[PDB]
Amino acid sequence: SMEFPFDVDALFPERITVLDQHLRPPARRPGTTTPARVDLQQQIMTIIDELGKASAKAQNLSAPITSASRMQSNRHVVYILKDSSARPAIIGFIKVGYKKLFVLDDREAHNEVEPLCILDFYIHESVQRHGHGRELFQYMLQKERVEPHQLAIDRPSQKLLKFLNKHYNLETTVPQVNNFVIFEGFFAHQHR
Amino acid sequence: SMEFPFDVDALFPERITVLDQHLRPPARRPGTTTPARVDLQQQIMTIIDELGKASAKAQNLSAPITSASRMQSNRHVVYILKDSSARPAIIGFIKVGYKKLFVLDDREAHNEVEPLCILDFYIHESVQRHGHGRELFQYMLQKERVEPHQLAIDRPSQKLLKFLNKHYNLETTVPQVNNFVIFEGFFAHQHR
Numbered sequence: 001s002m003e004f005p006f007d008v009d010a011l012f013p014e015r016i017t018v019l020d021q022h023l024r025p026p027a028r029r030p031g032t033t034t035p036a037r038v039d040l041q042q043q044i045m046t047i048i049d050e051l052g053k054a055s056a057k058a059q060n061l062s063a064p065i066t067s068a069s070r071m072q073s074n075r076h077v078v079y080i081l082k083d084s085s086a087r088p089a090i091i092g093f094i095k096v097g098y099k100k101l102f103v104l105d106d107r108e109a110h111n112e113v114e115p116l117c118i119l120d121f122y123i124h125e126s127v128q129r130h131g132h133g134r135e136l137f138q139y140m141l142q143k144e145r146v147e148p149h150q151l152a153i154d155r156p157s158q159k160l161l162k163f164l165n166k167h168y169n170l171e172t173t174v175p176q177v178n179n180f181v182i183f184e185g186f187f188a189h190q191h192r
Numbered sequence: 193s194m195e196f197p198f199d200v201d202a203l204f205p206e207r208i209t210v211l212d213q214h215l216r217p218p219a220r221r222p223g224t225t226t227p228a229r230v231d232l233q234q235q236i237m238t239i240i241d242e243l244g245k246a247s248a249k250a251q252n253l254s255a256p257i258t259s260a261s262r263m264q265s266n267r268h269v270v271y272i273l274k275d276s277s278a279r280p281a282i283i284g285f286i287k288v289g290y291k292k293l294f295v296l297d298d299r300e301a302h303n304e305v306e307p308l309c310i311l312d313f314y315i316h317e318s319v320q321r322h323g324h325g326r327e328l329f330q331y332m333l334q335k336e337r338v339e340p341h342q343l344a345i346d347r348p349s350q351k352l353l354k355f356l357n358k359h360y361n362l363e364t365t366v367p368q369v370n371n372f373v374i375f376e377g378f379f380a381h382q383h384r
């Protein structure tokens with residue numbers, strides 16, 4: 001299980017914490033002496049760096065695709081799952097963002113579009129296949145106000161393909177040259 | 193945790209079970225009514241098939257690299273780790289075999305050789321990073337009568353590269369065109 005040299009429960013009061021390019025420390029309930037926000041932001045940056053590294057090891061990548069730096073220079077949104085009732089905290093994350101994609105269609109019509117993309121997604125190995133990925137995915141869909149078949153996925157893994165099929169009945173449609181994956185229903189003339 | 197529709201503790205009495213192309217059922221202590229060996233062998237084949245599929249999902253491969261069929265047609269040896277004291281069994285495996293490799297050296301001498309190769313290796317996600325991989329690797333080295341720096345690795349993952357460096361001080365040497373990895377000391381003129 002993952003761990004940091006600072007109080008993650010204080011930093012992240014909610015079970016799922018949303019962060020964007022501002023990397024803004026969550027507000028806390030009044031009363032406690034809160035560290036300086038600059039220092040809280042460095043804690044968040046270290047968490048994102050380490051989560052990105054862990055995801056890269058899980059995915060057999062030579063370099064992370066998620067980092068604090070890349071958060072600050074992009075318009076990515078990360079959702080970080082803690083357990084507040086852990087004994088004796090951070091479980092994983094999902095990172096999304098809108099991307100311009102020059103997408104190939106199936107009747108062969110081809111074009112541009114900017115869907116919300118699933119960019120990185122990781123649940124710690126020890127608690128994979130327990131339902132944490134689904135909780136995190138569900139929360140992200142609700143906040144982004146997106147439906148599953150509207151997504152594009154950047155280079156999904158085998159585990160993720162199975163996940164998407166199980167939870168959302170997502171079936172792949174036309175392969176795409178750009179290595180993003182889209183599903184039946186992505187195009188308006190498709191069903192589901 | 194992994195699970196099968198038959199008694200793995202009866203099938204595999206030892207914590208680490210070695211199997212080769214014969215896929216021979218382990219002998220048991222006298223007394224129990226043992227199923228027919230053909231049926232025990234089918235149980236073993238199903239275990240190897242499922243372990244290979246799990247390893248392929250872990251590794252983001254489109255197809256397994258380990259299967260009962262491929263065991264029977266190759267000269268591969270698999271070491272399967274159970275826990276006999278599990279509550280309320282199979283943890284993972286390592287697969288090895290000798291392979292002819294047309295290896296590129298570092299003073300640029302180049303040639304043929306047939307080292308023992310690490311071909312597949314998987315510990316269930318739930319108990320990765322607990323020391324199970326090391327126990328299994330240690331047992332395999334002792335049985336094969338091989339030293340770590342004598343090995344070649346078929347397409348090691350990032351996790352495995354870190355593992356080998358931690359436990360055995362293995363540092364990569366000349367990259368190889370064949371996608372196998374070898375370490376300093378593989379060649380007789382190298383140290384360690």
Ligand SMILES: CC(=O)SCCNC(=O)CCNC(=O)[C@H](O)C(C)(C)COP(=O)(O)OP(=O)(O)OC[C@H]1O[C@@H](n2cnc3c(N)ncnc32)[C@H](O)[C@@H]1OP(=O)(O)O
Pocket residue numbers: 058059118119120121122123124127128129130131132133134135153154155156157158159160162163164166249250
């Ligand atoms: C764009 C990208 O981010 S690609 C990279 C995606 N991330 C990774 O592949 C990293 C490693 N894997 C993980 O981090 C996680 O397994 C995730 C994020 C893919 C899924 O989250 P989880 O918490 O494991 O999933 P959750 O428990 O909610 O759902 C389980 C389902 O996911 C799929 N799944 C999860 N683990 C596996 C596995 N080892 N083998 C096959 N399918 C799996 C299956 O559909 C499974 O349902 P099943 O058990 O009925 O077969």
Ligand SMILES: CC(=O)SCCNC(=O)CCNC(=O)[C@H](O)C(C)(C)COP(=O)(O)OP(=O)(O)OC[C@H]1O[C@@H](n2cnc3c(N)ncnc32)[C@H](O)[C@@H]1OP(=O)(O)O
Pocket residue numbers: 057058250251310311312313314315316319320321322323324325326327345346347348349350351352354355356358
């Ligand atoms: C030729 C091939 O088989 S390539 C494919 C290898 N298999 C895989 O990559 C599948 C997924 N991973 C696994 O199955 C396992 O993690 C294995 C087989 C690689 C290693 O077995 P484990 O039981 O996890 O290793 P064990 O606990 O004995 O040793 C731990 C060490 O392995 C490495 N390691 C294990 N998990 C990770 C990880 N998530 N991130 C980075 N390094 C890791 C580290 O060196 C670690 O030591 P550390 O915790 O001090 O950093």
Ligand code: NA
Pocket residue numbers: 058059125250317
């Ligand atoms: Na993983």
Ligand code: NA
Pocket residue numbers: 058125250251317
């Ligand atoms: Na894994």
